Each structure stands twice: as C-alpha cells, then as structure tokens.
Amino acid sequence: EVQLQESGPSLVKPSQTLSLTCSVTGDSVTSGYWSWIRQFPGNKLDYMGYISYRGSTYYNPSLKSRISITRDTSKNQVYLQLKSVSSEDTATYYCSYFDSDDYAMEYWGQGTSVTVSGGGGSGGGGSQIVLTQSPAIMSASPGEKVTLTCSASSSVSSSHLYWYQQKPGSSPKLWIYSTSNLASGVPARFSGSGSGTSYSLTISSMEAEDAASYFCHQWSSFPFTFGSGTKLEIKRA
Numbered sequence: 394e395v396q397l398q399e400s401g402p403s404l405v406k407p408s409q410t411l412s413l414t415c416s417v418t419g420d421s422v423t424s425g426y427w428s429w430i431r432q433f434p435g436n437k438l439d440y441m442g443y444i445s446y447r448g449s450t451y452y453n454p455s456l457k458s459r460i461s462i463t464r465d466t467s468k469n470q471v472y473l474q475l476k477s478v479s480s481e482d483t484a485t486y487y488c489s490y491f492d493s494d495d496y497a498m499e500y501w502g503q504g505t506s507v508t509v510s511g512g513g514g515s516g517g518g519g520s521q522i523v524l525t526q527s528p529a530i531m532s533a534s535p536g537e538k539v540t541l542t543c544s545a546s547s548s549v550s551s552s553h554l555y556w557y558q559q560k561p562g563s564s565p566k567l568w569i570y571s572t573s574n575l576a577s578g579v580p581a582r583f584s585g586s587g588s589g590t591s592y593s594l595t596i597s598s599m600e601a602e603d604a605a606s607y608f609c610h611q612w613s614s615f616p617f618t619f620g621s622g623t624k625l626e627i628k629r630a
C-alpha cells in the first residue's frame with residue numbers, strides 16, 4: 394500500500410555533498426516516520442535518522458553535523474543530504490516507512506548504491522546499544538531445527554526488538570516484530586523469543602528458501618541499531 398524508490402548518483406568525490414531522493418507512492422498516511430538507513434560492504438546496517446509526519450527530525454549523533462532530512466509533501470518525496478563524504482560513506486542507501494500505530498509492518502525501498510572516489514581519511518557524541526549476532530555464518534541441512542541469537546549490550550524493551558531477512562540483490566524485509574510476532578509473509582515455522590538483553594529467532598524445520606541473512610534490530614533506545622548479522626546457508630555442494 395506504499396512503495397518507495399531511491400534515486401541519485403552512484404559515485405561521488407570526497408568533500409562533495411551526497412544527495413538522494415526517495416520517491417514515495419501509494420495510499421496517503423495520517424502519521425508515521427520516513428527513515429534513511431544505509432548498508433556498507435560487509436552488510437552492516439546503519440540507522441541515519443528520520444523525518445516524521447509532522448516534520449520532526451532525528452539524526453544519528455554520529456552524522457549530526459553532516460546530515461539533513463527534508464520532506465516535500467506536494468510532490469510526495471523525502472530527501473537525504475550528506476556533506477563531506479569519504480570512502481566511509483560508500484554504501485547502498487535505503488529509505489523506509491513505519492507507522493508507530495502498526496508495529497507489524499515496515500516498508501523499504503530498492504536501495505540505490507552510492508560510492509565515493511577512493512581515498513578519504515565530526516561532532517556528535519552519544520551512546521548506543523550494541524547488538525551482537527553469533528555465529529556470523531552458519532550452515533544447516535534441510536530439516537534441522539535452527540536457532541539464531543541476538544545479544545544486546547544493555548537491556549531493551551522486548552516489544553522493540555525486531556528481526557529482518559535479506560537476500561542478495563534485495564532489501565531487508567521485516568521478519569519478526571516485538572520479540573515473537575511474525576510479520577506478514579513469514580512461514581509459521583519461524584518463531585522468536587527473549588527478554589532483557591537476550592533474544593533468539595528459531596526455524597523449526599530448515600527449508601532451502603530460508604538460506605539468507607538475518608539481522609536483529611533495536612529501537613527501544615536512540616539511536617536505533619542493528620546487529621552484526623548472521624548469514625545462513627544450506628549444506629550440500
């Protein structure tokens with residue numbers, strides 16, 4: 394009921410100002426937030442910030458000085474602006490929409506990759522909860538019961554702990570909301586559980602289509618964060 398697409402340069406030179414556009418299409422909305430989230434090579438996800446239905450903005454302290462997210466209702470678009478880019482800003486950028494009143498769904502765009510002309514070598518200050526996913530890579534044969542864990546460095550509200558599945562050439566899809574609730578499109582063979590600083594995702598019976606990457610997410614404390622991630626594979630060469 395809502396679709397998003399990112400557009401902008403695929404390569405930028407240092408010091409230049411990276412600019413991206415998020416074209417939103419679908420039903421109108423009476424609330425919510427539009428976030429920008431980027432993914433670096435290695436697939437680590439970084440929450441950049443958002444702009445709400447009412448224009449309120451929030452930036453990850455780590456980008457504070459260089460970022461700005463603006464909206465343009467008339468043409469149903471939201472923007473990303475990032476100054477003083479460096480090789481550390483190279484990553485595929487995604488925009489996403491979420492309605493606080495509907496914890497169960499999230500919309501992500503295709504994600505346009507952006508690079509910075511090789512090289513690159515500033516005033517935030519903040520704290521954040523670290524999410525650790527071990528093991529990093531895993532193989533299981535079809536039929537095995539699989540369990541993935543997410544360890545938080547500090548307690549988080551279990552209702553704000555989410556899981557995501559992602560496959561090559563595609564963006565993250567909401568898999569589990571509020572520790573143990575499956576999202577739309579998820580086979581019931583999946584389940585989640587946990588509390589405090591300990592959570593886990595479980596697959597009762599491993600299917601070939603479950604091979605992909607899984608990331609846990611925390612939005613109990615600002616800035617929201619994502620886990621290192623677990624890449625799951627199927628055995629048999």
Ligand SMILES: CN[C@@H](C)Cc1ccc2c(c1)OCO2
Nearest residue numbers: 426428443491499555612617
């Ligand atoms: C579950 N994914 C998160 C990142 C969606 C989101 C974005 C902004 C919001 C909100 C939730 O809570 C308050 O500000």
